Amino acid sequence: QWDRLVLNTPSFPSNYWDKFVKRKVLDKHGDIFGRERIAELLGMDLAS
Amino acid sequence: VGSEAFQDYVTDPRGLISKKDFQKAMDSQKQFTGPEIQFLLSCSEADE
Structure with a gap:
């Protein structure tokens, strides 16, 4: 709940070292969801 | 049917979903390929 x-x-x-976790989560979640x-x-913005 | 995006695809308060809405929802979730959605439309119960 705090996260x-x-x-x-x-x-x-x-x-955290990885900076593209948001994009990875969009890749494996959002096509279906x-x-x-x-x-x-x-x-984050799709055009961005 | 249980998924909630498909609930945002159902529109009328009849509790049902239009043919075009169902087809484009199926394609948007990509749980079914094109001919699979066509066969789902063939087996579906069309209304007025």
Whole structure:
């Protein structure tokens, strides 16, 4: 419930080395579960 | 049917889903290929 805060923050994978975890989660989730919904959950934009 | 994106695809308060809406929902989730969705439409119960 506390981790839900940094789901959409642009600095989600800041301390963690991997910086493209949001894109990976979009790749394996959102094709089936709604790409716009996963983008909203991760706080990142498709055009970006 | 249990999934919630398909609930955002169902529109009328009849509790049902249109033929075009069902077809494009099937394609959007990609649980079924093109001919598979065509066969689902063949077995589906068309309404007014």
